[PDB]
Design an enzyme around this catalytic site. Structure first.
Site, short mmCIF file in Angstrom:
data_model
loop_
_atom_site.label_atom_id
_atom_site.label_comp_id
_atom_site.label_asym_id
_atom_site.label_seq_id
_atom_site.Cartn_x
_atom_site.Cartn_y
_atom_site.Cartn_z
N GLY A 11 145.52 35.89 11.13
CA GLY A 11 144.63 35.26 10.14
C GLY A 11 143.22 35.17 10.70
O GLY A 11 143.03 35.39 11.92
N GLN B 197 134.47 31.64 11.83
CA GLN B 197 134.82 32.24 13.14
C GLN B 197 133.96 33.46 13.43
O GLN B 197 133.82 33.79 14.60
CB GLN B 197 136.28 32.64 13.16
CG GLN B 197 137.22 31.46 13.20
CD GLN B 197 138.65 31.91 13.34
OE1 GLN B 197 139.29 32.37 12.36
NE2 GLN B 197 139.14 31.82 14.58
N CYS C 140 144.48 30.48 18.46
CA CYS C 140 143.21 30.61 17.71
C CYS C 140 142.32 31.66 18.38
O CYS C 140 142.15 31.59 19.62
CB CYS C 140 142.55 29.25 17.67
SG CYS C 140 141.15 29.16 16.55
N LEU C 141 141.72 32.55 17.61
CA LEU C 141 140.71 33.50 18.14
C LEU C 141 139.52 32.73 18.73
O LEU C 141 138.80 33.31 19.55
CB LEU C 141 140.18 34.43 17.05
CG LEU C 141 141.22 35.17 16.23
CD1 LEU C 141 140.61 35.75 14.96
CD2 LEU C 141 141.86 36.25 17.08
N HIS D 196 146.02 26.43 9.03
CA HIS D 196 145.11 26.67 10.19
C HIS D 196 143.75 27.22 9.68
O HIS D 196 142.69 26.74 10.08
CB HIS D 196 145.83 27.61 11.17
CG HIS D 196 144.97 27.98 12.34
ND1 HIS D 196 145.29 27.63 13.64
CD2 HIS D 196 143.83 28.67 12.42
CE1 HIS D 196 144.41 28.12 14.46
NE2 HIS D 196 143.47 28.75 13.73
N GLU D 197 143.79 28.18 8.76
CA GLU D 197 142.58 28.84 8.23
C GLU D 197 141.78 27.88 7.34
O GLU D 197 140.55 27.89 7.45
CB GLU D 197 142.93 30.12 7.48
CG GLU D 197 143.67 31.14 8.33
CD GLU D 197 143.04 31.53 9.65
OE1 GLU D 197 141.81 31.41 9.79
OE2 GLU D 197 143.80 31.92 10.57
N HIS E 238 139.80 25.67 9.40
CA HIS E 238 138.56 26.33 9.88
C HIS E 238 137.42 26.14 8.86
O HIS E 238 136.28 25.91 9.31
CB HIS E 238 138.71 27.83 10.18
CG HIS E 238 139.20 28.15 11.55
ND1 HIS E 238 138.61 27.63 12.69
CD2 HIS E 238 140.24 28.91 11.96
CE1 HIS E 238 139.24 28.08 13.75
NE2 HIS E 238 140.23 28.89 13.33
O1 LIG Z 1 142.18 31.58 14.90
C1 LIG Z 1 142.74 32.12 13.88
O2 LIG Z 1 142.56 31.66 12.80
C2 LIG Z 1 143.68 33.24 14.06
C3 LIG Z 1 145.01 32.78 14.63
C4 LIG Z 1 145.90 32.38 13.44
C5 LIG Z 1 147.17 31.55 13.62
C6 LIG Z 1 147.37 30.39 12.90
C7 LIG Z 1 148.52 29.61 13.02
C8 LIG Z 1 149.54 30.03 13.89
C9 LIG Z 1 149.35 31.19 14.63
C10 LIG Z 1 148.20 31.94 14.49
C11 LIG Z 1 145.33 34.04 15.48
O3 LIG Z 1 146.24 34.90 14.85
S1 LIG Z 1 145.86 33.62 17.09
C12 LIG Z 1 146.96 34.81 17.83
C13 LIG Z 1 148.42 34.58 17.45
C14 LIG Z 1 149.14 35.57 16.77
C15 LIG Z 1 150.48 35.37 16.44
C16 LIG Z 1 151.11 34.17 16.78
C17 LIG Z 1 150.39 33.19 17.45
C18 LIG Z 1 149.05 33.39 17.79
ZN LIG Z 2 141.84 29.70 14.47
#
Ligand SMILES: O=C(O)C[C@@H](Cc1ccccc1)[C@H](O)SCc1ccccc1
Ligand SMILES: [Zn+2]
Ligand SMILES: O=C(O)C[C@@H](Cc1ccccc1)[C@H](O)SCc1ccccc1
Ligand SMILES: [Zn+2]
Lengths: 158, 145
Positions: free
Chosen positions: A49, A54, A102-103, A144-145, A148
Protein backbone atom coordinates in the site's frame (compact mmCIF):
# COMPACT_ATOMS: atom_id res chain seq x y z
CA UNK A 1 6.63 5.04 -14.69
CA UNK A 2 8.55 7.21 -12.09
CA UNK A 3 9.68 6.00 -8.60
CA UNK A 4 9.17 9.04 -6.28
CA UNK A 5 11.14 10.00 -3.13
CA UNK A 6 9.51 8.76 0.13
CA UNK A 7 9.12 10.91 3.28
CA UNK A 8 10.56 9.38 6.51
CA UNK A 9 9.32 9.65 10.14
CA UNK A 10 10.51 13.06 11.48
CA UNK A 11 9.29 14.87 8.30
CA UNK A 12 6.29 17.15 9.01
CA UNK A 13 4.46 16.24 5.68
CA UNK A 14 3.67 12.84 7.41
CA UNK A 15 1.78 14.62 10.29
CA UNK A 16 -0.68 16.84 8.23
CA UNK A 17 -4.30 16.08 7.32
CA UNK A 18 -4.21 15.59 3.52
CA UNK A 19 -6.59 17.71 1.40
CA UNK A 20 -9.42 16.08 -0.60
CA UNK A 21 -9.09 15.65 -4.39
CA UNK A 22 -11.42 18.19 -6.13
CA UNK A 23 -14.08 17.11 -8.71
CA UNK A 24 -12.21 18.76 -11.69
CA UNK A 25 -9.15 16.49 -10.93
CA UNK A 26 -11.30 13.33 -11.46
CA UNK A 27 -10.79 11.51 -14.84
CA UNK A 28 -7.67 13.72 -15.54
CA UNK A 29 -4.17 12.82 -16.92
CA UNK A 30 -2.96 14.68 -13.77
CA UNK A 31 -4.67 12.09 -11.43
CA UNK A 32 -3.71 9.07 -13.63
CA UNK A 33 0.00 10.12 -13.59
CA UNK A 34 -0.08 10.71 -9.77
CA UNK A 35 -1.60 7.20 -9.23
CA UNK A 36 0.91 5.65 -11.69
CA UNK A 37 3.95 7.26 -9.91
CA UNK A 38 2.57 6.20 -6.45
CA UNK A 39 2.04 2.63 -7.81
CA UNK A 40 5.63 2.44 -9.26
CA UNK A 41 6.94 3.78 -5.89
CA UNK A 42 5.02 1.12 -3.85
CA UNK A 43 6.29 -1.77 -6.14
CA UNK A 44 9.97 -0.46 -6.09
CA UNK A 45 9.89 -0.73 -2.24
CA UNK A 46 8.01 -4.10 -2.23
CA UNK A 47 5.05 -2.38 -0.49
CA UNK A 48 1.38 -3.56 -0.28
CA UNK A 49 0.00 0.00 0.00
CA UNK A 50 0.98 3.68 -0.21
CA UNK A 51 -0.60 7.07 0.66
CA UNK A 52 0.13 10.31 -1.32
CA UNK A 53 1.63 12.11 1.77
CA UNK A 54 4.50 9.53 1.80
CA UNK A 55 5.61 10.98 -1.60
CA UNK A 56 5.18 14.65 -0.42
CA UNK A 57 1.67 14.99 -1.93
CA UNK A 58 -0.78 16.22 0.76
CA UNK A 59 -3.82 14.74 -1.10
CA UNK A 60 -6.40 12.04 -0.18
CA UNK A 61 -5.22 9.30 -2.58
CA UNK A 62 -4.17 5.77 -1.39
CA UNK A 63 -3.33 2.43 -3.04
CA UNK A 64 -4.17 -0.89 -1.33
CA UNK A 65 -2.75 -4.19 -2.64
CA UNK A 66 -2.40 -7.49 -0.73
CA UNK A 67 -0.05 -10.51 -0.94
CA UNK A 68 0.32 -13.66 1.26
CA UNK A 69 3.34 -13.55 3.68
CA UNK A 70 4.52 -15.24 6.93
CA UNK A 71 2.03 -13.29 9.17
CA UNK A 72 -1.02 -13.87 6.80
CA UNK A 73 -0.51 -16.88 4.45
CA UNK A 74 -4.29 -16.87 3.44
CA UNK A 75 -4.10 -13.10 2.58
CA UNK A 76 -5.19 -12.71 -1.07
CA UNK A 77 -2.88 -11.73 -3.93
CA UNK A 78 -4.69 -8.48 -4.91
CA UNK A 79 -3.55 -5.96 -7.58
CA UNK A 80 -3.47 -2.24 -6.62
CA UNK A 81 -6.85 -0.57 -5.91
CA UNK A 82 -6.48 3.26 -6.24
CA UNK A 83 -8.87 4.98 -3.77
CA UNK A 84 -9.60 8.72 -4.11
CA UNK A 85 -11.16 10.49 -1.05
CA UNK A 86 -11.57 7.16 0.80
CA UNK A 87 -13.90 7.26 3.86
CA UNK A 88 -14.15 4.44 6.39
CA UNK A 89 -17.97 4.33 7.11
CA UNK A 90 -17.74 1.48 9.67
CA UNK A 91 -15.09 -0.33 11.75
CA UNK A 92 -16.03 -3.87 12.99
CA UNK A 93 -16.15 -4.38 16.80
CA UNK A 94 -13.97 -7.51 16.25
CA UNK A 95 -10.33 -6.39 16.63
CA UNK A 96 -7.16 -8.41 15.89
CA UNK A 97 -3.45 -7.68 16.20
CA UNK A 98 -1.30 -7.96 13.06
CA UNK A 99 2.27 -7.31 11.88
CA UNK A 100 2.68 -3.93 10.09
CA UNK A 101 5.57 -2.14 8.42
CA UNK A 102 5.76 1.30 6.78
CA UNK A 103 7.78 2.71 3.82
CA UNK A 104 8.12 5.89 5.99
CA UNK A 105 9.48 3.86 8.99
CA UNK A 106 11.78 1.38 7.17
CA UNK A 107 13.71 0.47 10.43
CA UNK A 108 10.77 -1.01 12.49
CA UNK A 109 7.90 -3.52 12.24
CA UNK A 110 5.22 -3.95 14.92
CA UNK A 111 1.95 -5.50 16.07
CA UNK A 112 -1.04 -3.12 15.67
CA UNK A 113 -4.66 -3.67 16.81
CA UNK A 114 -6.93 -3.08 13.73
CA UNK A 115 -10.64 -3.62 12.96
CA UNK A 116 -10.92 -7.10 11.37
CA UNK A 117 -13.38 -5.58 8.80
CA UNK A 118 -13.98 -1.99 7.49
CA UNK A 119 -16.66 -0.63 5.16
CA UNK A 120 -14.99 1.91 2.80
CA UNK A 121 -16.48 4.32 0.25
CA UNK A 122 -14.13 5.91 -2.32
CA UNK A 123 -13.88 7.28 -5.85
CA UNK A 124 -12.04 5.48 -8.69
CA UNK A 125 -9.58 7.59 -10.76
CA UNK A 126 -12.55 8.08 -13.19
CA UNK A 127 -14.71 9.48 -10.35
CA UNK A 128 -16.98 6.43 -9.96
CA UNK A 129 -18.31 5.90 -6.41
CA UNK A 130 -17.55 2.45 -4.88
CA UNK A 131 -18.42 0.93 -1.46
CA UNK A 132 -16.52 -2.27 -0.45
CA UNK A 133 -15.97 -4.22 2.79
CA UNK A 134 -12.28 -5.19 3.39
CA UNK A 135 -11.41 -8.13 5.74
CA UNK A 136 -8.12 -9.28 7.25
CA UNK A 137 -4.74 -8.09 5.87
CA UNK A 138 -6.34 -5.73 3.27
CA UNK A 139 -8.54 -4.20 6.09
CA UNK A 140 -5.27 -3.56 8.03
CA UNK A 141 -3.65 -1.95 4.94
CA UNK A 142 -6.71 0.33 4.35
CA UNK A 143 -6.67 1.44 8.01
CA UNK A 144 -2.84 2.09 7.85
CA UNK A 145 -3.21 4.19 4.62
CA UNK A 146 -6.19 6.29 5.91
CA UNK A 147 -4.07 6.90 9.08
CA UNK A 148 -1.39 8.39 6.66
CA UNK A 149 -4.06 10.78 5.22
CA UNK A 150 -4.84 11.87 8.85
CA UNK A 151 -1.21 12.42 9.89
CA UNK A 152 -0.83 9.14 11.92
CA UNK A 153 2.08 6.60 11.79
CA UNK A 154 1.54 2.96 12.92
CA UNK A 155 4.18 3.35 15.75
CA UNK A 156 1.77 5.84 17.44
CA UNK A 157 -0.77 2.89 17.68
CA UNK A 158 1.58 0.47 19.52
CA UNK B 1 -5.76 21.14 -18.03
CA UNK B 2 -6.57 20.69 -14.28
CA UNK B 3 -6.92 23.69 -11.91
CA UNK B 4 -5.69 22.43 -8.47
CA UNK B 5 -7.21 23.48 -5.13
CA UNK B 6 -5.02 26.12 -3.41
CA UNK B 7 -3.88 26.00 0.24
CA UNK B 8 -4.76 29.14 2.32
CA UNK B 9 -2.79 30.79 5.17
CA UNK B 10 -3.43 28.69 8.30
CA UNK B 11 -2.78 25.38 6.45
CA UNK B 12 0.36 23.60 7.83
CA UNK B 13 1.45 22.66 4.20
CA UNK B 14 2.49 26.34 3.52
CA UNK B 15 4.87 26.23 6.58
CA UNK B 16 7.10 23.24 5.58
CA UNK B 17 10.48 23.08 3.80
CA UNK B 18 9.48 21.56 0.46
CA UNK B 19 11.52 18.50 -0.64
CA UNK B 20 13.81 18.72 -3.72
CA UNK B 21 12.58 16.98 -6.89
CA UNK B 22 14.57 13.67 -7.38
CA UNK B 23 16.57 12.75 -10.54
CA UNK B 24 13.90 9.97 -11.10
CA UNK B 25 11.21 12.66 -11.71
CA UNK B 26 13.19 14.71 -14.30
CA UNK B 27 11.90 14.33 -17.93
CA UNK B 28 8.87 12.31 -16.62
CA UNK B 29 5.19 12.46 -17.64
CA UNK B 30 4.58 12.96 -13.87
CA UNK B 31 6.66 16.18 -13.75
CA UNK B 32 5.21 17.68 -17.00
CA UNK B 33 1.62 17.01 -15.74
CA UNK B 34 2.54 18.64 -12.34
CA UNK B 35 3.95 21.74 -14.20
CA UNK B 36 0.82 21.93 -16.49
CA UNK B 37 -1.63 21.73 -13.54
CA UNK B 38 0.39 24.37 -11.61
CA UNK B 39 0.40 26.55 -14.80
CA UNK B 40 -3.41 26.16 -15.32
CA UNK B 41 -4.06 26.98 -11.59
CA UNK B 42 -1.87 30.13 -11.83
CA UNK B 43 -3.72 31.39 -15.02
CA UNK B 44 -7.24 30.55 -13.68
CA UNK B 45 -6.39 32.54 -10.47
CA UNK B 46 -4.87 35.36 -12.68
CA UNK B 47 -1.50 34.89 -10.86
CA UNK B 48 2.04 35.74 -12.15
CA UNK B 49 3.69 32.87 -10.25
CA UNK B 50 3.02 29.77 -8.12
CA UNK B 51 4.92 27.26 -5.95
CA UNK B 52 3.99 23.55 -5.56
CA UNK B 53 3.21 23.84 -1.77
CA UNK B 54 0.30 26.22 -2.66
CA UNK B 55 -1.35 23.21 -4.44
CA UNK B 56 -0.54 20.76 -1.54
CA UNK B 57 2.62 19.40 -3.25
CA UNK B 58 5.65 19.71 -0.87
CA UNK B 59 8.16 19.79 -3.82
CA UNK B 60 10.67 22.53 -4.92
CA UNK B 61 8.92 23.54 -8.22
CA UNK B 62 7.96 27.16 -8.98
CA UNK B 63 6.56 29.01 -12.01
CA UNK B 64 7.35 32.69 -12.80
CA UNK B 65 5.47 34.71 -15.48
CA UNK B 66 7.34 37.32 -20.22
CA UNK B 67 6.27 33.69 -21.00
CA UNK B 68 6.08 31.46 -17.85
CA UNK B 69 9.30 29.65 -16.81
CA UNK B 70 9.04 26.45 -14.75
CA UNK B 71 11.98 26.07 -12.34
CA UNK B 72 12.84 22.75 -10.59
CA UNK B 73 15.08 22.84 -7.44
CA UNK B 74 15.73 26.60 -7.86
CA UNK B 75 18.56 28.21 -5.85
CA UNK B 76 19.25 31.99 -5.61
CA UNK B 77 23.07 32.12 -6.25
CA UNK B 78 23.46 35.91 -6.54
CA UNK B 79 21.39 39.02 -5.74
CA UNK B 80 21.84 42.83 -5.73
CA UNK B 81 22.60 44.52 -2.38
CA UNK B 82 20.23 47.16 -3.96
CA UNK B 83 16.63 46.62 -2.75
CA UNK B 84 13.25 47.66 -4.26
CA UNK B 85 9.87 47.82 -2.45
CA UNK B 86 7.08 46.35 -4.68
CA UNK B 87 3.38 45.61 -3.90
CA UNK B 88 2.85 41.82 -3.34
CA UNK B 89 -0.26 39.58 -3.23
CA UNK B 90 -0.50 35.80 -2.77
CA UNK B 91 -2.91 33.12 -4.12
CA UNK B 92 -2.66 31.53 -0.59
CA UNK B 93 -3.53 34.81 1.30
CA UNK B 94 -6.56 36.00 -0.72
CA UNK B 95 -7.46 39.78 -0.59
CA UNK B 96 -4.18 40.78 1.18
CA UNK B 97 -1.72 43.33 -0.37
CA UNK B 98 1.52 44.78 1.06
CA UNK B 99 4.81 46.46 0.10
CA UNK B 100 7.70 43.91 0.40
CA UNK B 101 11.44 44.82 0.13
CA UNK B 102 13.17 42.41 -2.33
CA UNK B 103 16.58 42.34 -4.05
CA UNK B 104 16.10 44.23 -7.35
CA UNK B 105 18.31 41.62 -9.20
CA UNK B 106 18.57 37.84 -8.55
CA UNK B 107 20.56 35.12 -10.32
CA UNK B 108 18.78 31.75 -10.14
CA UNK B 109 20.20 28.27 -10.86
CA UNK B 110 17.52 25.59 -11.54
CA UNK B 111 16.72 22.42 -13.51
CA UNK B 112 14.43 22.48 -16.59
CA UNK B 113 11.59 19.87 -16.67
CA UNK B 114 14.01 17.79 -18.86
CA UNK B 115 16.56 18.06 -15.95
CA UNK B 116 19.36 20.25 -17.48
CA UNK B 117 21.02 22.82 -15.12
CA UNK B 118 20.45 26.44 -16.22
CA UNK B 119 21.09 29.95 -14.85
CA UNK B 120 19.08 33.15 -15.47
CA UNK B 121 19.14 36.63 -13.94
CA UNK B 122 15.83 38.40 -13.18
CA UNK B 123 15.47 42.17 -12.58
CA UNK B 124 12.51 44.13 -11.23
CA UNK B 125 9.06 42.48 -11.14
CA UNK B 126 10.11 38.90 -12.14
CA UNK B 127 12.91 39.14 -9.45
CA UNK B 128 10.25 39.92 -6.74
CA UNK B 129 8.14 36.94 -7.98
CA UNK B 130 11.14 34.49 -7.91
CA UNK B 131 11.98 35.57 -4.30
CA UNK B 132 8.27 35.22 -3.28
CA UNK B 133 8.08 31.68 -4.79
CA UNK B 134 11.42 30.56 -3.20
CA UNK B 135 10.02 31.85 0.17
CA UNK B 136 6.98 29.45 -0.39
CA UNK B 137 9.47 26.50 -0.79
CA UNK B 138 11.02 27.51 2.61
CA UNK B 139 7.74 27.78 4.53
CA UNK B 140 7.54 31.65 4.44
CA UNK B 141 4.46 33.76 3.56
CA UNK B 142 5.03 37.40 2.43
CA UNK B 143 2.95 38.72 5.43
CA UNK B 144 5.93 37.63 7.67
CA UNK B 145 7.94 40.32 5.76
O1 LIG C 1 3.82 2.50 4.61
C1 LIG C 1 2.91 2.01 3.86
O2 LIG C 1 1.83 2.52 3.83
C2 LIG C 1 3.16 0.76 3.12
C3 LIG C 1 3.16 -0.46 4.03
C4 LIG C 1 1.70 -0.94 4.12
C5 LIG C 1 1.25 -1.92 5.20
C6 LIG C 1 0.17 -1.63 6.01
C7 LIG C 1 -0.29 -2.50 7.00
C8 LIG C 1 0.34 -3.74 7.17
C9 LIG C 1 1.44 -4.04 6.37
C10 LIG C 1 1.87 -3.16 5.40
C11 LIG C 1 4.24 -1.29 3.29
O3 LIG C 1 3.68 -2.28 2.47
S1 LIG C 1 5.42 -1.95 4.40
C12 LIG C 1 6.16 -3.48 3.83
C13 LIG C 1 5.33 -4.70 4.20
C14 LIG C 1 4.83 -5.55 3.20
C15 LIG C 1 4.09 -6.69 3.55
C16 LIG C 1 3.83 -6.98 4.88
C17 LIG C 1 4.33 -6.14 5.87
C18 LIG C 1 5.08 -5.01 5.54
ZN1 LIG D 1 2.93 3.46 6.07
O1 LIG E 1 1.39 33.50 -4.21
C1 LIG E 1 1.91 33.47 -5.35
O2 LIG E 1 2.96 32.94 -5.38
C2 LIG E 1 1.26 34.08 -6.56
C3 LIG E 1 1.35 35.62 -6.66
C4 LIG E 1 2.81 35.97 -7.04
C5 LIG E 1 3.37 37.36 -6.79
C6 LIG E 1 4.61 37.49 -6.14
C7 LIG E 1 5.17 38.76 -5.91
C8 LIG E 1 4.52 39.91 -6.36
C9 LIG E 1 3.30 39.78 -7.01
C10 LIG E 1 2.75 38.52 -7.24
C11 LIG E 1 0.16 36.00 -7.61
O3 LIG E 1 0.49 36.44 -8.93
S1 LIG E 1 -0.84 37.24 -6.85
C12 LIG E 1 -1.84 38.16 -7.99
C13 LIG E 1 -1.10 39.39 -8.50
C14 LIG E 1 -0.89 39.57 -9.88
C15 LIG E 1 -0.19 40.69 -10.35
C16 LIG E 1 0.30 41.65 -9.45
C17 LIG E 1 0.11 41.48 -8.07
C18 LIG E 1 -0.59 40.36 -7.60
ZN1 LIG F 1 2.32 33.46 -2.71
Amino acid sequence: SVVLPVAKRGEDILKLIAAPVSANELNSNWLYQLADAMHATMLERNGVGIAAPQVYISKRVIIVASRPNPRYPDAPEMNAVVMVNPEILEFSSETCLGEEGCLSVPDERGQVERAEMVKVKYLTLQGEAVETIFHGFPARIVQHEVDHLNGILFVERI
